[PDB]
Amino acid sequence: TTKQICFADRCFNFAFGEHVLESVESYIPRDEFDQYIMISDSGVPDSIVHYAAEYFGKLAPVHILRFQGGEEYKTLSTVTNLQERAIALGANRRTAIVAVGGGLTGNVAGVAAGMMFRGIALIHVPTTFLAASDSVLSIKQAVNLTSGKNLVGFYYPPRFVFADTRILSESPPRQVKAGMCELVKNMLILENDNKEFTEDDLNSANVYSPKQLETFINFCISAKMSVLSEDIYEKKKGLIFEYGHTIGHAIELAEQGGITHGEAIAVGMIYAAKIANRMNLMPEHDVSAHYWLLNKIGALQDIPLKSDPDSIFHYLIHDNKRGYIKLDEDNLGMILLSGVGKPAMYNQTLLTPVRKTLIKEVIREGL
Amino acid sequence: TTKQICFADRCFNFAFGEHVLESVESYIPRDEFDQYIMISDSGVPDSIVHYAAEYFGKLAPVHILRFQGGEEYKTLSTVTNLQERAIALGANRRTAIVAVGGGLTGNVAGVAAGMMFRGIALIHVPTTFLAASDSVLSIKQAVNLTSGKNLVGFYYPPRFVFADTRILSESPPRQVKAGMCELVKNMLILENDNKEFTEDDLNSANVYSPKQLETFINFCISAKMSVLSEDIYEKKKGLIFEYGHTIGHAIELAEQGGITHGEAIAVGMIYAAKIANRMNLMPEHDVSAHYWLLNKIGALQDIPLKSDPDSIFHYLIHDNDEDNLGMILLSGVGKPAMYNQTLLTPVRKTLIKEVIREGL
């Protein structure tokens, strides 16, 4: 399957299916690019990297560039070293950067590619379900400073995306689960019949076929791009993709790598639902709909939540990776819903002011 | 004097005149920014930096960040250090970065600003005539890699530009000359029968009044923006502003700091003219016209072609088919030579080499 993705007038083909890469030659013009610089963080399996390199190798010479994985090395310094090594390989304006990995590699490679010669071709090969169904459906690129996550970056589209659903289907279930959390976020925030699966197709093991993941990817493409095609910077209606993220991101920091992003977000959406209900915005049945879908993917079942309430609050009021978290002394802005499919508006924005009372309460009581 | 500059849909006011910073409260609202991080490389006279801090302070807290100047330190690593320090000072989405310096400070602060929170306000206070009349009239931002110049960057527009013509009138004459070379380049590449100055107004000592510099800046705004307003990435008709730069960049490298960028460009334009002549595009008179105008500004005076042709040609072939290199050429003054729907004309490497050998 091939979908045409467009962020305003910046379009790319997102091909996804089994052995898409062995069909790369059908998607990229024979002499589009004179060289492939393949970029992959050190945690990506070598078998995926070497496999991708052999197929890109049918079009033009490929070089493989690894770098040290982990959020500690997701920095402009890692980017510079990759750009230097690329130039030392003879990279030029006709080179494409092929990012082979999850979202960490996507971001690092996207910052590299968006700056080299003021911007060269970026091709995504997402190897995690979260990268394939969420993070490559965003043109934000960012890396970390010592004082914060994703503090430096910009907006930069790819030229191509290839998601191999056989690779995704063999990925770790805890990682599939993480991207399934964001998929269930998409189900709760936006009205849909434009999905070719039901809640019956969700399972709590997070083990899916290549074809089921293909169908999930298609739904995420439709869902996200229905909003981001027009809101490319994710500053308006695109705030909706931050449902569950306000508290979720703080919990994610507090747990210091103990929980996945998707798990933190799943918990963050449960909190948002309870808050919207405690504010009279959302009926109880809609809150129960959050628990019902999240349990279907086994989201809340695991979840080694080890941090204290005060540490979660600390991370929340000291956070800068989104603008306008703390409105005034008493209130944080949150993306809340009046119901499944129904974002709550406040003053022509998706940020509803929420009293710190309710936030501390839901955090302390947990699940 | 204020001109609205528009890169497509991204506009800013460019204010320029004497003691222009004294009137800052007339351009930027009070509410607008919570804070000003004023960045300047170590080579910028401290008096200018403190002077600018003083007037921005009338609006909001200003913190000054200095960084080691020079092309060797114009890197992403300097940018990161500047960003981290700005974060340590409480920089946020409502902070403006104020770049006080020449094109080097502009580019370093430009990249810094373009990346923080994925883009905060950039404010230029250009203190060299080159920056005021050329580099601030481009949304190109870039820094260096080990392997070469300006290899990493992006396009990012500023929110305001303030050029104090008094400061510029007192900058070193060799620095003024460098920006006058790009002005001459504008004269040579665009047709304009309605300039507010003539060739008689150009001098070789490169000493001008504040008002004369304001007139040159205005000329440069009209000239570049007549093309760049539409061609924002400088990839189409905006390639014209690279006239003299193909051999220029390489001369500038070969000389190792010994000549300015305008001087290198000046020489690169003469070689481009000779080239277009040997290729039957340019009459001999237009070639002399290049020499004539550049000698008006003393462009060829402090020039040491301390270099052999071979050093120049090597940097040229290492600069990012096999017998040709593309050049912007002209058929005559004000007359860009088109080739196959583009401003890039293939030129034989062996021809380039022989013109360089022959010299001025």
Ligand SMILES: NC(=O)c1ccc[n+]([C@@H]2O[C@H](COP(=O)([O-])OP(=O)(O)OC[C@H]3O[C@@H](n4cnc5c(N)ncnc54)[C@@H](O)[C@@H]3O)[C@@H](O)[C@H]2O)c1
């Ligand atoms: N990347 C681009 O598209 C682009 C375009 C134009 C310029 N630039 C960069 O700018 C540099 C050249 O620009 P420039 O001529 O403005 O010089 P510059 O910024 O390199 O300045 C040269 C020297 O002037 C000092 N200086 C600044 N203001 C002064 C003043 N008022 N009086 C005395 N000294 C002063 C220093 O900062 C410095 O030691 C190059 O590195 C060039 O790449 C880049």
Ligand SMILES: NC(=O)c1ccc[n+]([C@@H]2O[C@H](COP(=O)([O-])OP(=O)(O)OC[C@H]3O[C@@H](n4cnc5c(N)ncnc54)[C@H](O)[C@@H]3O)[C@@H](O)[C@H]2O)c1
């Ligand atoms: N661009 C955006 O809008 C955007 C969106 C969401 C997330 N992100 C970024 O993505 C990162 C998280 O992304 P992620 O969840 O994809 O994980 P990740 O990139 O952090 O990868 C997680 C781990 O899985 C490895 N890995 C990758 N593919 C694998 C596979 N098939 N099998 C086994 N291991 C594999 C990695 O090397 C790694 O150690 C963060 O840096 C985040 O901010 C960016």
Ligand SMILES: O=P(O)(O)OC[C@H]1C[C@@H](O)[C@H](O)[C@@H](O)[C@@H]1O
């Ligand atoms: O950083 P680059 O791509 O080398 O571009 C710089 C040029 C950009 C252009 O707008 C200006 O007219 C030129 O003098 C200037 O040298």
Ligand SMILES: C=C1C[C@@H](O)[C@H](O)[C@@H](O)[C@@H]1O
């Ligand atoms: C920050 C983002 C960008 C947005 O596009 C995604 O849905 C989110 O899940 C992701 O965390």
Ligand SMILES: O=S([O-])[O-]
């Ligand atoms: O976490 S959210 O729903 O603002």
Ligand SMILES: O=S([O-])[O-]
């Ligand atoms: O130097 S230019 O004329 O390509």
Ligand SMILES: [Co+2]
């Ligand atoms: Co998320």
Ligand SMILES: [Co+2]
């Ligand atoms: Co120039």
